[PDB]
Design a binder for this molecule. Structure first.
Ligand SMILES: Nc1ncnc2c1ncn2[C@@H]1O[C@H](COP(=O)(O)OP(=O)(O)OP(=O)(O)O)[C@@H](O)[C@H]1O
Ligand SMILES: [Mg+2]
Length: 333
């Protein structure tokens, strides 16, 4: 309905100007012209909740969610499944928590743990670059970082991606992990400047100024990148984010940064480092997303884009358990 659309737009204009009596008449008129107008129902629900009429607000929200008979079935079924899913999810976080406490309890000065921590360091670097076509083997990566001699018959681009990761991981471990205070845009840029610096030092440490496309994702317009990065870091240091389970917080921080995708390149590597910083600050070890999990990683990211991030959190939770099981397995004494 063209009149329903018009009635809602004026209803919202009257709401901003503080004419609530006129806004209500127009909300009612929008629903008279189109009873199944989702926008007007949801928006009139928000208006009703502001006036502290909870029953009416709930009626309008529920009406908007259940237009057709198949929506009604979806709601009654979802209301049944949600509690069971909440239980399954909560269980999996408590299972991770127990394994974290077992890893943390082990003395920092342990012969076994030190070897594992040293070996898994190169595993993360390997998987973080190999997941997007870096053909360097694990022994080659160690050679590059331990000796600082280049390997033969492998591109300087591939090897400078490894050097950049090592530089970024050192910076975090020494400077940021134990640093008490808020994480700022500058800190993210400092990580990115090291991650991409050795490959593209021109673009390393500054936002993109062009439109791009990441897989099946449409990231923000370059002119809106900076505002969304300000809103992002505001959330990072919010009380809401502090309450979240570290794995949930680390997963959300990861997804939000690759959604904004504020750099021309190195967005994945940067967002995975920020994920591990948050976990390390919370007392968890650094986790790895293996190159074998690329399709799963992309699938849960595409699901997150279309408005369900829970699969991505669950995916990061799986990657966390796998990392902990690897540390706990090395009790070979
Ligand atoms: N649908 C999606 N929505 C959001 N982010 C996505 C999506 N698909 C992929 N990504 C992320 O974007 C990354 C690719 O962007 P970019 O090339 O800037 O990262 P990179 O650091 O060069 O790659 P990588 O770290 O994976 O080796 C992927 O690795 C992934 O983390
Ligand atoms: Mg890339």
């Amino acid at each position: 309905s063209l009149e329903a659309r018009a009635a809602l737009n004026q209803a919202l204009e009257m709401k901003r100007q503080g004419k609530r009596e006129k806004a209500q008449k127009l909300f009612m008129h929008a629903l008279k012209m189109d009873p199944d107008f989702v926008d007007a129902l949801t928006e009139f629900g928000i208006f009703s909740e502001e006036d502290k009429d909870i029953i009416q607000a709930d009626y309008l929200y529920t009406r908007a969610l259940t237009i057709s008979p198949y929506h009604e079935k979806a709601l009654v079924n979802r209301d049944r499944t949600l509690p069971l899913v909440e239980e399954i999810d909560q269980r999996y976080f408590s299972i991770i928590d127990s394994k974290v406490k077992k890893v943390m309890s082990i003395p920092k000065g342990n012969s076994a743990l030190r070897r594992v921590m040293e070996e898994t360091y190169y595993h993360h670097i390997y998987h973080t670059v190999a997941i997007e076509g870096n053909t360097l083997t694990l022994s080659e990566i160690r050679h590059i970082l331990e000796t600082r001699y280049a390997v033969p018959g492998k591109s300087d681009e591939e090897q400078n991606e490894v050097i950049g990761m090592h530089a970024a991981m050192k910076y975090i471990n020494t400077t940021l992990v134990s640093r008490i205070g808020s994480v700022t845009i500058s800190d993210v840029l400092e990580i990115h400047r090291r991650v991409l610096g050795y490959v593209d030092p021109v673009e390393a440490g500054r936002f993109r100024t062009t439109q791009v496309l990441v897989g099946h994702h449409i990231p923000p317009h370059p002119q809106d990148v900076e505002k969304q990065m300000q809103e992002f870091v505001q959330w990072l240091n919010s009380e809401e984010a502090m309450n979240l389970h570290p794995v949930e917080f680390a997963a959300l921080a990861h997804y939000k940064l690759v959604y904004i995708h504020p750099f021309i390149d190195g967005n994945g590597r940067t967002s995975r480092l920020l994920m591990n910083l948050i976990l390390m600050q919370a007392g968890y070890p650094p986790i790895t997303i293996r190159k074998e999990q690329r399709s799963d990683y992309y699938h849960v990211l595409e699901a997150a884009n279309e408005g369900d991030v829970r699969p991505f959190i669950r995916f990061i939770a799986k990657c966390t358990e796998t990392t902990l099981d690897t540390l706990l397995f090395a009790t070979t004494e």
